[PDB]
Every structure is written in structure tokens, then in C-alpha cells.
Design a protein around this ligand. Structure first.
Ligand SMILES: [Zn+2]
Ligand SMILES: [Zn+2]
Lengths: 218, 217
């Protein structure tokens, strides 16, 4: 198994620089091109550049001249991309990809690195339980939820019962407002099992190094 | 810039039926070396892109053989012999013939399934929120089809447009439905001046909207 493991989410101030990495394993690092692509929230893909670690050779998108620089460390099988003079236009998920060979495309992909470029301050989420009671909730299934409000930046990770409850979960995309994000998650379980079988949402916000667990009680 | 033009959406495709997605390039993608620099990628919600087809018609490793591609060197087609529910996502064409390499805008594949009414659940503000001076009323509208839906909030019977925040899921990879969340955010002060809170959904599965509500007292 070829693996491309990217560095974690970044919150950085405009005008600064950031260097994100992609650690490759499972193949001869120097024998394959690695490329980088940008995806702004809700948009398509933009290609940034390719690097051949056995060179070192690079091919670049001139739209990013002066802004992006690609490097590779053969000693650690890691590729790097540095982004400078950052603005909110650079806020995006960046992916690294391995080029399968002679023009056979990006066959293996990293998980992406979220970069947020902002002056706003990191803010932990408030997590509120959504429980039924003021109106008998349907009959065979019951819907519960969590309201995750007032955090910055993206992302948060939402699970239920630390991931052991996954069927019937709906976690909604966050919406930004007033410089803070709000997200919701619902979970639907059999009526006969709540509250006997407890239900708890787990909301992780790595940017603020905070996780909060909220048990949903009647 | 070589421009790759794709439709933003597919017609809804019946599960198990064939589908096609097209891309047109502003320039031939065939080289003098005999190589056609056309690729098809798929991105599923919350996932990294997956290569499906390379050099216009070659099947990528890890891609199911339900996928195939063809083209003239200028015009291209991705085909799906039998669509599966898990194939929902955005399909991108791309070129690396010339710098800068570019992508098409992506085509969303939509699965056609039977109509389904939203299951609507409404929730008053938690005590924890009220203590901070806030009052969010949440309405979930889950597992409906088709995606077209309108939500209206009413306070004491009067439409409220202010303070609503809506979020929508992508089509579910298992049951091909959609879900939506709508949150009306008030201050505690204002929330405690009124009594009835109502979430109303307009959807093709009902003449009258589906209404969920509660009374604060
Ligand atoms: Zn669902
Ligand atoms: Zn009022």
C-alpha cells in the first residue's frame, strides 16, 4: 500500500507563509512525480505544480508564480509545498497526488490539508443537546441531535457514541456567519432504545485542542 | 488556458441503468507523440479524488470496469454501464497536455429514486444555550427525495426570515435521499416574548407543507 499522508489543518494569518507536507510510502519515492492541487470550498480543482524527487525537477502553474514553491526531502520521502503572502483566496483544501507513471494520471491521493487564512481568533465550539419531549416524536424511530455553534476555524469532527453509532447519522455542512461557524448533526435510532441505550455526540475541534461530549437526555 | 467544458449536472439516473458524462476541450489533447492527455476523476462528498480513466480510454487501477471512456481527441465521454448508489459525486475531466494543467468544472451525478417525504423533527433551545443569552430552534428534514424543498419558519404565526441558517447534505450514497437542517437563531430575550415556533416544509410529496411546532409555555 502506497500511502500519502498529509500534514494537519492550518489556521494562519494573512501575509504569512505556510509549509504543508506529504509523506509518501509504499513505493520508490524518487521514481514518481507528486503533484499538488487546490480545492476552494464549494469549487472545483486547480493544479498547482508537480515535483519529481529523483531530479529534483518541478513543473509549475504560473498562475501561482511567487506564491507556491515545491520541494522534496529524499531522506524522509516527504514532499513539501510552501505558500506565501497568504490571503483568504488561499483558504482551501490542498491535496498531494502520485502520478502513476508515464501520463497515467494521479493514481494515489493524500487525504488533503485544510488551510484557513484569517485574522479571526480560534474559538472552541459550544455543543448543545437536541432532545425530544415537547411533542411526542413520531412513533418507531426517534431523532436526536447536537447543535455545534460558535467555533472557528473549520474543521470539527462529529461522532456518536465515539463512533459506534453510525447508521442513521446526518452531519450537516458548517455555515459561517459573523466570523463563526455553526454545524448540526442528527441521529435516528429505534424508539425502544432511547434513553435505555444512551446516545452521546462527540465533537472534536483540533484547532482549539478541544473535544466535547454531550449525552442526550430526555 | 485550455478550457474543459462539462455540464454541471447529469439528469437523474435510475439505479442500475447506464449513464454518460461529456467533456469538450478547447483544443485537441492528442500529442504528436500519440498520447491523449485526458483523465477522468471522481470526487465523493468529503473524500479525496479518485482516478477512473487515464489517456481518454484506459481504465485506472482500482476503478471498477463499469466505468469506460472514449473520445475524438477533442470531445470525450465517460460512461457508466450500470450505475450504483455509491457512484454519486462529482466527475471531473482534466488535461495535462499543456501548461497550466486544468480541470473541467465537474458534473454531479444524481441517482433517480422513488419520491420520499421528509421526516421532520423540531427542537427548542437547550437550557445550556439559553443561559448564554441565545435561543436556537432547530428543524431537521431528513431522507427526502427529490432534493427540491423550501422551509418556512413562523413565530406566533408570523413568517420569520431573519436569523435562519440552512445546511444541506449531498445525496446519500446508500439510500439516495437528501437531508436538510434549518436553525432559527434568536436571542433569549426575543425567544421568551413569543410562544409558538413552527417549521414548515414545502416538498412535492404533499399539497400542504409538513409542519412541526411547539409552544414555549
Ligand atoms: Zn438519513
Ligand atoms: Zn418579537
Amino acid at each position: 500500500e502506497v500511502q500519502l499522508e498529509e500534514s494537519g489543518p492550518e489556521l494562519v494569518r494573512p501575509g504569512t507563509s505556510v509549509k504543508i507536507s506529504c509523506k509518501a510510502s509504499g513505493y520508490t519515492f524518487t521514481n514518481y512525480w507528486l503533484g499538488w492541487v487546490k480545492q476552494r470550498p464549494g469549487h472545483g480543482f486547480e493544479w498547482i505544480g508537480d515535483i519529481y524527487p529523483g531530479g529534483v525537477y518541478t513543473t509549475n502553474n504560473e498562475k501561482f508564480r511567487g506564491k507556491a514553491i515545491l520541494t522534496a526531502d529524499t531522506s524522509s520521502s516527504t514532499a513539501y509545498m510552501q505558500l506565501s503572502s497568504l490571503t483568504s483566496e488561499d483558504s482551501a483544501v490542498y491535496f498531494c497526488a502520485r502520478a502513476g507513471g508515464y501520463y497515467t494520471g494521479g493514481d494515489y491521493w493524500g487525504q488533503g490539508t485544510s488551510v484557513t487564512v484569517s485574522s479571526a481568533k480560534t474559538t472552541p465550539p459550544s455543543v448543545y443537546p437536541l432532545a425530544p419531549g415537547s411533542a411526542a416524536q413520531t412513533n418507531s424511530m426517534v431523532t436526536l441531535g447536537c447543535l455545534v455553534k460558535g467555533y472557528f476555524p473549520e474543521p470539527v469532527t462529529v461522532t456518536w457514541n465515539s463512533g459506534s453509532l453510525s447508521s442513521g447519522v446526518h452531519t450537516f455542512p458548517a455555515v459561517l456567519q459573523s466570523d463563526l461557524y455553526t454545524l448540526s448533526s442528527s441521529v435516528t435510532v429505534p424508539s425502544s432504545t432511547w434513553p435505555s441505550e444512551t446516545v452521546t455526540c462527540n465533537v472534536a475541534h483540533p484547532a482549539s485542542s478541544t473535544k466535547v461530549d454531550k449525552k442526550i437526555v430526555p | 488556458d485550455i478550457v474543459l467544458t462539462q455540464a454541471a449536472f447529469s439528469n437523474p439516473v435510475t439505479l442500475g441503468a447506464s449513464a454518460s458524462i461529456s467533456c469538450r476541450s478547447s483544443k485537441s489533447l492528442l500529442n504528436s507523440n500519440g498520447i491523449i492527455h485526458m483523465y477522468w476523476y471522481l470526487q465523493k462528498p468529503g473524500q479525496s479524488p479518485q482516478l477512473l480513466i487515464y489517456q481518454m480510454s484506459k481504465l485506472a487501477s482500482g476503478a471498477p470496469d463499469r466505468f469506460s471512456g472514449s473520445g475524438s481527441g477533442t470531445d470525450f465521454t465517460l460512461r457508466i454501464s450500470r450505475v450504483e448508489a455509491e457512484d454519486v459525486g462529482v466527475y471531473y475531466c482534466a488535461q495535462n497536455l499543456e501548461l497550466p494543467y486544468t480541470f473541467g468544472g465537474g458534473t454531479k451525478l444524481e441517482i433517480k429514486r422513488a419520491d420520499a417525504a421528509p421526516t421532520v423533527s423540531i427542537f427548542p433551545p437547550s437550557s445550556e444555550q439559553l443561559t448564554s443569552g441565545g435561543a436556537s430552534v432547530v428543524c431537521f428534514l431528513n431522507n427526502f427525495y427529490p432534493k427540491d424543498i423550501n422551509v418556512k419558519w413562523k413565530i406566533d404565526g408570523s413568517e420569520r426570515q431573519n436569523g435562519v441558517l440552512n445546511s444541506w447534505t449531498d445525496q446519500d450514497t446508500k439510500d439516495s435521499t437528501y437531508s436538510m437542517s434549518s436553525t432559527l437563531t434568536l436571542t433569549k430575550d426575543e425567544y421568551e416574548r413569543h410562544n409558538s415556533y413552527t417549521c414548515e416544509a414545502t416538498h412535492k410529496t404533499s399539497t400542504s407543507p409538513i409542519v412541526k411546532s411547539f409552544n414555549r409555555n
